[PDB]
């Protein structure tokens, strides 16, 4: 009775060998900067957790991005900050330059290095087969680093990947959902955006790990090489699992939930149906044929798997023949 436990197959026990300070973010003391050093230029957007602005560091006259947090539990702000400090300097991790107290909101404001990002909707229409492989490898460097530091991103999606295409620069941003991986810990399944939620979240399996990020990256890859954005376009969280099952098949879905003794929400009874696994070539056509290769499909196939334990790790993914043609460094 109850679900079967699960462990990450890599980087399992990294946090228990660190000192308590590394992962116990509740006791982290935030070192504050000076909010006067930054002038807000224009608002870039806002979600449920923050407001984001382009700003200028008035001292060195450099452009920055300021994330003004909305009031949330102090432990969650400390979690994002402690994760940003732990990962600072890592490959393709956005750099947290400063932390100030916003005088209006009275909440913390995070100052980030600026990236000349082109929005992904316009940019992805111009990416070549080589560009997709190049940037995918760059994303994998960031994911492998943070996984090796005991951290799941949990919100991998195009809007959290800043790309300066003119200078071949890529940064992984928005660590507000990131958590430390502790083996056997049951996590909140309400993470990531709908289109990039792993099946473990969609079936309410709480004991997931880094491999969640690899499913989300597989979603990004499928969307880029097939020119279908997003690839699994569910109308809600339940239709999202149906969308996956229409491509991967219901057989492997039931094998997955049976392995972990998971019981699906009975509202799937009348919507899930019976579907065979589709061959990837059905999504190939004249307009995306130049982005599809045997290597790309094998790689995608090893990422988009129901069983989180069977997906490629970030480190394994970088060894895939899909990246042989990419010049490194």
């Amino acid at each position: 009775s109850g679900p079967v436990p699960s462990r990450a197959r890599v980087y399992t026990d990294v946090n228990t060998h660190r000192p308590r300070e590394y992962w116990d973010y509740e006791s982290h003391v935030v070192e504050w900067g000076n909010q006067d050093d930054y002038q807000l230029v224009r608002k870039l957007g806002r979600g449920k957790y923050s407001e984001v602005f382009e700003a200028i560091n008035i001292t060195n006259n450099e452009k920055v991005v300021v994330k003004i947090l909305k009031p949330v539990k102090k432990k969650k702000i400390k979690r994002e900050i402690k994760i940003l400090e732990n990962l600072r300097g890592g490959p393709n991790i956005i750099t947290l330059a400063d932390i100030v107290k916003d005088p209006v909101s009275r909440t913390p404001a995070l100052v980030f290095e600026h990236v000349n990002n082109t929005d992904f909707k316009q940019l992805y229409q111009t990416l070549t087969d080589y560009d997709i492989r190049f940037y995918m490898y760059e994303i994998l460097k960031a994911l492998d680093y943070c996984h090796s530091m005991g951290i799941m991103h949990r919100d991998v999606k195009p809007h959290n990947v800043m790309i300066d295409h003119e200078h071949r620069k890529l940064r992984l941003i928005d660590w507000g959902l990131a958590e430390f991986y502790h083996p056997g810990q049951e996590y909140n399944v309400r993470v990531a955006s709908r289109y990039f939620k792993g099946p473990e979240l969609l079936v309410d399996y709480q004991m997931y790990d880094y491999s969640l990020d690899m499913w989300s990256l597989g979603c990004m890859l499928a969307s880029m090489i097939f020119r279908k954005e997003p690839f699994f376009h569910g109308h809600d969280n339940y239709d999202q699992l149906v969308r996956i099952a229409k491509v991967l098949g219901t057989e492997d879905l039931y094998d997955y939930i049976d392995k972990y003794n998971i019981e699906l929400d009975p509202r799937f009874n009348d919507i899930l149906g019976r579907h065979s696994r589709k061959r990837w070539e059905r999504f190939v056509h004249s307009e995306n044929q130049h982005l599809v290769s045997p290597e790309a499909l094998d790689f995608l196939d090893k990422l988009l798997r129901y069983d989180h334990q069977s997906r490629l790790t970030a480190r394994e993914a970088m060894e895939h023949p899909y990246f042989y043609t990419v010049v490194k460094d």
């Binding site: 449920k48 539990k73 996590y187 309400r190 993470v191 990531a192 955006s193 709908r194």
Partner: peptide, 7 residues
């Protein structure tokens, strides 16, 4: 976004 976290 489009979801929300606490754990």
């Amino acid at each position: 976004x489009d979801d929300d976290d606490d754990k």
